Protein backbone atom coordinates (compact mmCIF):
# COMPACT_ATOMS: atom_id res chain seq x y z
CA UNK A 1 0.00 0.00 0.00
CA UNK A 2 1.11 3.54 -0.85
CA UNK A 3 -0.97 5.00 1.92
CA UNK A 4 -2.39 4.15 5.32
CA UNK A 5 -3.87 5.65 8.49
CA UNK A 6 -1.44 6.40 11.28
CA UNK A 7 -1.68 8.32 14.52
CA UNK A 8 0.66 11.20 13.74
CA UNK A 9 1.92 12.15 17.15
CA UNK A 10 3.24 9.95 19.94
CA UNK A 11 0.67 9.14 22.62
CA UNK A 12 1.18 8.53 26.31
CA UNK A 13 0.80 9.66 29.85
CA UNK A 14 2.35 11.70 32.53
CA UNK A 15 4.71 10.15 34.94
CA UNK A 16 6.32 11.29 38.13
CA UNK A 17 8.16 14.54 37.80
CA UNK A 18 6.00 15.77 34.97
CA UNK A 19 7.60 13.82 32.18
CA UNK A 20 5.85 12.16 29.30
CA UNK A 21 6.09 8.46 28.96
CA UNK A 22 5.15 7.24 25.56
CA UNK A 23 2.85 4.55 24.86
CA UNK A 24 2.03 4.71 21.21
CA UNK A 25 4.83 6.01 18.99
CA UNK A 26 4.23 8.66 16.36
CA UNK A 27 3.38 7.40 12.93
CA UNK A 28 2.16 4.14 14.22
CA UNK A 29 -0.33 2.57 11.88
CA UNK A 30 -3.85 2.24 13.18
CA UNK A 31 -5.60 0.40 14.57
CA UNK A 32 -3.33 -0.60 17.36
CA UNK A 33 -3.23 -1.65 20.96
CA UNK A 34 -0.53 -1.12 23.49
CA UNK A 35 -0.26 -1.80 27.18
CA UNK A 36 2.30 -0.95 29.81
CA UNK A 37 2.48 -1.52 33.56
CA UNK A 38 3.09 1.28 36.00
CA UNK A 39 3.24 1.74 39.75
CA UNK A 40 2.83 4.38 42.39
CA UNK A 41 5.19 7.29 42.92
CA UNK A 42 5.05 7.10 46.73
CA UNK A 43 4.25 5.04 49.78
CA UNK A 44 0.63 4.43 50.81
CA UNK A 45 -0.92 5.79 47.63
CA UNK A 46 -4.54 4.85 47.14
CA UNK A 47 -5.16 6.71 43.94
CA UNK A 48 -3.52 7.67 40.70
CA UNK A 49 -4.33 10.04 37.86
CA UNK A 50 -3.99 9.21 34.21
CA UNK A 51 -3.29 12.30 32.15
CA UNK A 52 -3.38 11.41 28.46
CA UNK A 53 -1.05 13.46 26.26
CA UNK A 54 -0.22 13.96 22.57
CA UNK A 55 3.24 14.96 21.40
CA UNK A 56 6.98 14.57 21.12
CA UNK A 57 8.22 16.68 24.05
CA UNK A 58 9.78 15.39 27.22
CA UNK A 59 7.89 17.94 29.32
CA UNK A 60 4.41 16.61 29.78
CA UNK A 61 3.40 20.22 29.99
CA UNK A 62 4.75 20.84 26.52
CA UNK A 63 2.45 18.34 24.96
CA UNK A 64 -1.21 18.32 24.08
CA UNK A 65 -3.60 17.17 26.76
CA UNK A 66 -6.29 14.92 25.40
CA UNK A 67 -7.70 14.21 28.81
CA UNK A 68 -7.61 12.50 32.13
CA UNK A 69 -9.21 10.40 34.83
CA UNK A 70 -8.54 8.96 38.24
CA UNK A 71 -8.01 5.43 39.36
CA UNK A 72 -9.01 4.99 42.95
CA UNK A 73 -9.43 2.20 45.44
CA UNK A 74 -5.83 1.14 45.28
CA UNK A 75 -4.77 -0.55 48.56
CA UNK A 76 -2.25 1.71 50.28
CA UNK A 77 0.96 -0.16 49.73
CA UNK A 78 4.64 0.76 49.34
CA UNK A 79 5.80 2.55 46.24
CA UNK A 80 6.44 0.42 43.22
CA UNK A 81 4.35 -2.41 44.51
CA UNK A 82 1.01 -1.87 42.84
CA UNK A 83 0.62 -3.01 39.28
CA UNK A 84 -1.41 -0.49 37.30
CA UNK A 85 -1.92 -1.70 33.76
CA UNK A 86 -2.48 1.13 31.34
CA UNK A 87 -3.70 0.51 27.85
CA UNK A 88 -4.01 2.75 24.83
CA UNK A 89 -6.10 1.41 22.02
CA UNK A 90 -7.00 3.23 18.78
CA UNK A 91 -9.77 1.77 16.64
CA UNK A 92 -10.09 1.96 12.88
CA UNK A 93 -12.02 5.22 12.90
CA UNK A 94 -9.39 6.88 15.13
CA UNK A 95 -11.29 6.68 18.40
CA UNK A 96 -8.90 6.38 21.31
CA UNK A 97 -9.71 4.36 24.40
CA UNK A 98 -7.54 4.58 27.46
CA UNK A 99 -7.86 2.16 30.36
CA UNK A 100 -6.10 1.74 33.65
CA UNK A 101 -6.44 -1.30 35.87
CA UNK A 102 -4.91 -2.01 39.29
CA UNK A 103 -4.10 -5.71 39.15
CA UNK A 104 -4.51 -6.34 42.87
CA UNK A 105 -7.74 -4.53 43.68
CA UNK A 106 -9.06 -5.08 40.15
CA UNK A 107 -10.23 -1.49 40.16
CA UNK A 108 -10.59 -0.20 36.61
CA UNK A 109 -11.35 3.08 34.87
CA UNK A 110 -11.69 4.37 31.35
CA UNK A 111 -11.89 7.28 28.98
CA UNK A 112 -12.90 7.64 25.37
CA UNK A 113 -11.25 10.13 23.07
CA UNK A 114 -12.59 11.40 19.77
CA UNK A 115 -10.51 10.94 16.68
CA UNK A 116 -10.75 14.66 15.99
CA UNK A 117 -9.19 15.67 19.28
CA UNK A 118 -5.65 16.84 19.53
CA UNK A 119 -3.42 18.75 17.22
CA UNK A 120 -3.97 19.80 13.64
CA UNK A 121 -1.45 19.57 10.86
CA UNK A 122 0.10 22.97 11.33
CA UNK A 123 0.38 22.20 14.97
CA UNK A 124 1.68 18.71 14.15
CA UNK A 125 4.48 20.05 12.00
CA UNK A 126 5.42 22.54 14.63
CA UNK A 127 5.55 20.00 17.44
CA UNK A 128 7.94 17.91 15.43
CA UNK A 129 10.06 20.81 14.38
CA UNK A 130 10.05 22.04 17.99
CA UNK A 131 10.93 18.65 19.48
CA UNK A 132 13.90 18.20 17.24
CA UNK A 133 15.08 21.74 17.90
CA UNK A 134 14.94 21.30 21.66
CA UNK A 135 16.27 17.76 21.72
CA UNK A 136 19.21 18.50 23.95
CA UNK A 137 17.02 20.34 26.49
CA UNK A 138 14.38 17.63 26.55
CA UNK A 139 17.09 15.09 27.23
CA UNK A 140 18.49 17.28 29.98
CA UNK A 141 15.02 17.54 31.40
CA UNK A 142 14.35 13.87 31.45
CA UNK A 143 17.50 13.06 33.33
CA UNK A 144 16.97 15.99 35.62
CA UNK A 145 13.77 14.33 36.56
CA UNK A 146 15.24 10.83 36.79
CA UNK A 147 17.60 12.26 39.37
CA UNK A 148 14.88 14.26 41.09
CA UNK A 149 12.81 11.14 41.58
CA UNK A 150 15.72 9.10 42.99
CA UNK A 151 16.18 11.82 45.47
CA UNK A 152 12.59 12.29 46.43
CA UNK A 153 12.74 8.60 47.12
CA UNK A 154 16.04 8.68 48.98
CA UNK A 155 14.33 11.31 50.96
CA UNK A 156 11.34 9.45 52.27
CA UNK A 157 13.51 6.42 52.69
CA UNK A 158 16.15 8.09 54.76
CA UNK A 159 13.42 9.75 56.80
CA UNK A 160 11.71 6.40 57.22
CA UNK A 161 14.90 4.70 58.34
CA UNK A 162 15.70 7.30 60.95
CA UNK A 163 12.28 7.72 62.45
CA UNK A 164 12.61 3.98 62.41
CA UNK A 165 15.52 3.79 64.84
CA UNK A 166 15.94 4.58 68.51
CA UNK A 167 19.66 4.15 69.00
CA UNK A 168 19.58 6.62 66.18
CA UNK A 169 23.24 6.62 67.04
CA UNK A 170 24.92 9.57 68.87
CA UNK A 171 21.95 11.56 67.71
CA UNK A 172 24.97 13.31 66.29
CA UNK A 173 24.50 10.79 63.59
CA UNK A 174 20.87 11.71 63.47
CA UNK A 175 21.68 15.39 63.40
CA UNK A 176 24.08 15.26 60.49
CA UNK A 177 21.39 13.54 58.51
CA UNK A 178 18.73 16.09 59.20
CA UNK A 179 21.14 18.78 58.15
CA UNK A 180 21.76 16.79 54.96
CA UNK A 181 18.12 16.06 54.31
CA UNK A 182 17.58 19.77 54.11
CA UNK A 183 20.38 20.46 51.74
CA UNK A 184 18.85 17.74 49.60
CA UNK A 185 15.32 18.93 50.04
CA UNK A 186 16.50 22.27 48.68
CA UNK A 187 18.84 21.02 46.00
CA UNK A 188 15.88 19.15 44.63
CA UNK A 189 13.99 22.33 43.83
CA UNK A 190 16.71 23.30 41.45
CA UNK A 191 17.19 22.39 37.86
CA UNK A 192 20.75 21.33 38.37
CA UNK A 193 21.21 17.59 38.29
CA UNK A 194 24.73 17.58 39.63
CA UNK A 195 23.87 19.52 42.71
CA UNK A 196 21.21 16.98 43.51
CA UNK A 197 23.51 14.02 43.13
CA UNK A 198 26.11 15.93 45.10
CA UNK A 199 23.79 16.26 48.05
CA UNK A 200 22.55 12.73 47.64
CA UNK A 201 26.15 11.68 48.09
CA UNK A 202 26.86 13.83 51.11
CA UNK A 203 23.71 12.42 52.58
CA UNK A 204 24.90 8.91 51.70
CA UNK A 205 27.96 9.68 53.71
CA UNK A 206 26.68 10.79 57.09
CA UNK A 207 24.34 7.80 57.07
CA UNK A 208 26.79 4.96 57.72
CA UNK A 209 25.32 4.07 61.08
CA UNK A 210 21.81 4.16 59.74
CA UNK A 211 22.68 2.17 56.66
CA UNK A 212 23.70 -0.14 59.44
Amino acid sequence: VLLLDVTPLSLGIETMGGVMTTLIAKNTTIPTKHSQVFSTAEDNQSAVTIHVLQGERKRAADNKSLGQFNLDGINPAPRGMPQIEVTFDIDADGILHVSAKDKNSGKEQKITIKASSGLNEDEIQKMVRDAEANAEADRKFEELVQTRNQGDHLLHSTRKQVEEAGDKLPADDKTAIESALTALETALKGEDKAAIEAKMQELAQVSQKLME
Partner: peptide, 9 residues
Amino acid sequence: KLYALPRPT
Protein backbone atom coordinates in the same frame (compact mmCIF):
# COMPACT_ATOMS: atom_id res chain seq x y z
CA LYS B 1 11.29 -0.90 33.01
CA LEU B 2 8.97 0.46 35.70
CA TYR B 3 7.46 3.92 35.77
CA ALA B 4 5.68 5.67 38.55
CA LEU B 5 2.21 7.64 38.50
CA PRO B 6 1.42 10.47 40.79
CA ARG B 7 -1.33 11.35 43.15
CA PRO B 8 -4.45 13.30 42.23
CA THR B 9 -4.87 16.87 43.41
